[PDB]
Nucleic acid binder design. Structure first.
Lengths: 309, 48, 309, 309, 48, 309, 48, 48
DNA sequence: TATATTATTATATATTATAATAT
DNA sequence: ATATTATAATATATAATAATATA
């Protein structure tokens, strides 16, 4: 109902995610048991912290939704440890971006809810109340696997299909109070590059654009106006993406050839291309840079309908 | 301070603080004739 | 409240290795001498310090639990050696990470318990008390050949046998108070991942399942419900792993692959895959890793009825 | 307090090798001059450092022991040369991994102990004292051809046969005061790949077995029960070795795959893999090496009662 | 410094200890012109 | 005293190559110039370093020598060519291993003995004094054909027959001055392998029996006990060649075999075997070269005592 | 720091040497009253 | 100190030794009455 | 004097590289 | 007979610390 919805049925995410470890934890809560540790991870900008905050609020427990790179010091870590009580829960964002001292002071906490601090000098035995840490990282491959042993639950994120995207945009437009057509929801889902939280941001932007030039209802001409304004159509092709693929088909026409060469042809930084442009079409069956080189399917050619055998 | 508060301060520098802020944290919430763990716990929420 | 076998005789899971370590315990006690240097290696995270504490209990003498960063200088380890006494022991870790100056310092320390040091050149000879030098690393292969040859006993560590894994699962469920089934215990031993910690995490999660889905009861069918609602295969595959298999047999169709293309198409960090999902199946051997691209082995082909080039 | 042999006849194995080296010893005695520089090639387990020490005492010269991996810069070499004097010798091992500038420094240093490297200004004319550098590497193929050609004494060090290994076990038990049955000596000699270092280690394990489970000296029955308790068959198999055998004959059908793949499957080093495998695999004829891979023989497959398909 | 003291200081310098703390530990505990091994033992008995 | 050949009369080698280099030197001296860049592709070191020393002796100038892989940078080559004076001799072994930029810089050196480099880019014009480049490499087959096209003088080398061993016995043993029997020299040639280096080793090692025993008897077993094992049926070959014949006959049946298959069977470098053992064994008619496989001739079967397949 | 020095550095860069090595080589020799080509030649003749 | 000592220092520097400890090894055993190769030998025996 | 202004010691990270292979 | 590029090293921009003239 807010900018970020609250109830779990508001955000019908991955049906496996929506089914597993939600009804299970809803039944398991109230058993006088402190919950164990949990990861949600995937592409960035997907509001995984919002999902964890949601999980905490149907658990009805005090939560401190925190960011790891903000909390670099062990002192604020211990401050958040003494902030909560028995059987509580803590939320941290981007745990993999921390100084090691964070992890070797949270290791006794993971072990036996213990705050071992050093001051011959001797370390001091300081127990902590039972708790829960949830992990909210973009990528946790660089996270150490002692932690991966300590964290008991992992959940991944993936690009959303058009049905989940359509349901999400319809629910969030009902949150936004729009008069969008179901065809409007489908066209908004197609224009968006998945990313349901960023898709919600795009829906808010498109709603502002439509309210600037009209009412809250969404019509196919308004969708075309937004697609031409944002230079991204329902095929998801960026203007730079469309221009570069037109350049590639204008010279090699699906010819499998090397990247440096195409980067010099486009006069663009190839690493920026690597980390932005082709992954998005690479999640679909569009771009297939081979050992011989780039291969683009004729499905992408169907944007203009010209292809060769 | 007492031995408990002194050990607390030593732990505070030993985890990254400096002595004068440890001192005013102890002085803000002083502990009386009990074990160190409880009032260092209110100090660590008292420092928030 | 972590897992701990109280004695090496009480230890289960590697009954043969339990027999040789009982042999070693009786060798030290019956001869009333310091036990030989025993080389320990296996899984990286297993609570080796806990095992050393159990061995310390078996001897009845203390063991100084030390590691590579603990003994990065020869000075502090020499100080501990001076603090060592007759018939003691000293746990050492990250010996491969340790400097070669540490290695030459410990050469006379285990060479009949002596010490040689220089001061125009002068020689100073020192003696050392007899003890049992303990060398434990995650991988013993980085150790220099003369030092390991000068070392005595070598002990390999590994995850338990499938029957041993099921026995340990049954013991932990009795510790956890779960009304487990031996068929369910064998199911967990099949899904044991080679990791007793993650296995115990699985016992916790299926205990949650049997609390919320079963009537506090654990059977084979309850275990099958839990490990059908989750990422399950008796080898240890996940829907992560199933997705990797589908893409690998789908994108390049059982050929060598480009890791950048894998990360772009799969939409996960390749480092996360090669740190989490790849190494277990490499231990399973179901892939072969080439300098021109990793290809799955015949297990994936028979897993989906696929041909061989 | 060590049981290291220090006699020429102590390493009576490889009698043609020992006779040729005795001829070289009497040659150096009759020369009363600089020896030809020596590159002995031989896999470990054979006491090759002990052999270098023994021939150094037969020269009546002091020996300094180090290796090629230890050295990293020709200045360290020059320091070692200055420490050596007339009538000295320096044990060097694994010279293949060494900086080349060390090699061009040592070319005149083995020509006539000379060093004429550049400081332009005045260059050095370092003519070293008369002492001959020797090498005790494992394989000379990975050694450079100019260094292999320039060094005079070259010899293969080989695993010892059952009679010499049993005699070595008997004489070491004599130093240890222990008594061995000749049949037990024969079985432990034909086990452990016929290598005196491993033979002595096995002797220590078997005498510990006779200290714990036995009540006296070692017989054939006591030794056999020791090997069965240690899970050592007539082939001297290790548990990791049996695991590798199972993987190569089952997962890979003889294993026609490179050493990198199998070493990663074990998660162990290439050098560790080979120096375990070849000294027993080659002498038993259970695997050969192909550019496709170290594929096992039919003999290895039929060892476990498996018929070749 | 005595011969045993100088040898012990050089030994602890080669061991990685700072020369000042090595000299302090060597001159603190043992006596004068004693056996080098045992006073090295006593100097390295110190811990933090 | 240097036992190595100094003058061309002292040189022992191919008479045809000797007359060819004699007429090259006469043509150079008749032009009042140094010898031009002579290409000598064949056995590296054997008759190549000695040939460069012959060129230095005939021209009466200082000689500087290096290697192919040593000169990684063209700037180093330009530095040494600038340091080379007029008419000086340069010996580079393995000239085929140069990076192409080194060869591009080197092309004016055998064009007109000047640094006429072809290179934001400035053509440096260094005063390059005339010099003789002793082009040494394994063969001209893998040589770059601009380089092989630009060499003014081209010649070859071959492994020598027993005449070089006879001339070595005539010359260097007289330089040695100790008695050698003529038929004793002939039976020494049973293992001399037609190699001047092996002949030098035999000259150094015949003295071994003379200094162990003062009686000085000469028999066939006395001549063989320097290398007591015969290591051959007859005429030159060694234990390594014995292993080669064993793996051709017992394993590869002496018939066709992949070159890499035989190389991995030897567990040795293909290039090392092909440079050392292959050409001499082909010379005595033991192997013929075929692209489909390395098949051995009638000599290999008949010397082994078995029938020809 | 000189025009001839800069020309020598650029020539050594074009010849394959590193700019840092070219600077070290042109600073290693005190080339004075000489042309750039001959100063480069004596610099190459200098160390070697 | 003489030209042999400076040549020894420069040769040890070009060999890769650190200049301050190379200079200390040279100055500890100078070749005032003996050759540069001999005092380089004695210096290289100093740090073994 | 303490302070900005020069030295000099690690540490990933964007580079260079090769092989083997389709093509 | 080109390229290409999937794995492998590598070298320096950016962190740090230690003298040093100067109002």
């Amino acid at each position: 109902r807010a900018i970020r919805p609250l109830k779990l049925a508001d955000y019908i995410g991955q049906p496996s995610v929506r089914e597993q470890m939600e009804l299970f934890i809803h039944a398991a809560r109230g058993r006088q048991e402190a919950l164990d540790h949990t990861l949600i991870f995937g592409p960035p900008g997907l509001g995984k912290t919002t999902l964890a905050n949601i999980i905490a609020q149907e658990m009805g427990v005090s939560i401190k939704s925190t960011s790891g790179p903000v909390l670099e010091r062990p002192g604020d870590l211990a401050a958040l440890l003494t902030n909560l009580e028995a059987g509580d829960v803590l939320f941290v964002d981007e745990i993999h971006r921390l100084s090691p001292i964070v992890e070797e002071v949270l290791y006794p906490a993971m072990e036996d809810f213990q705050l071992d601090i050093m001051i011959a000098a001797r370390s001091i035995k300081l127990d902590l109340p039972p708790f829960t840490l949830v992990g909210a990282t973009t990528r946790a491959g660089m996270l150490t696997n002692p932690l991966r042993d300590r964290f008991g639950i992992v959940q991944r994120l993936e690009f959303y299909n058009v049905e989940d995207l359509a349901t999400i945009v319809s629910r969030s437009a009902g949150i936004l109070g729009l008069e969008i057509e179901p065809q409007g929801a489908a066209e908004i889902a197609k224009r968006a590059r998945g990313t349901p939280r960023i898709a919600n941001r795009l829906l808010r932007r498109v709603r502002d654009f439509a309210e600037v030039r009209g009412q809250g209802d969404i019509t196919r001409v308004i969708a075309d106006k937004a697609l031409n304004l944002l230079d991204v159509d329902e095929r998801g092709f960026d203007h730079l993406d469309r221009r570069l693929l037109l350049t590639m088909i204008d010279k090699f026409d699906g010819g499998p050839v090397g990247i440096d060469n195409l980067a010099a042809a486009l006069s663009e930084e190839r690493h920026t291309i690597e980390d932005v442009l082709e992954p998005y079409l690479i999640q679909q069956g569009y771009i297939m840079r081979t050992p011989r080189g780039r291969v683009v399917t004729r499905h992408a050619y169907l944007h203009f309908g010209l292809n060769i055998p | 301070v007492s031995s408990a508060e002194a050990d607390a301060v030593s732990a505070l520098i030993a985890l990254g603080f400096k002595p004068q802020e440890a001192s005013r944290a102890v002085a803000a919430v002083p502990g009386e004739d009990l074990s160190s763990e409880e009032m260092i716990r209110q100090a660590l929420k008292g420092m928030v």
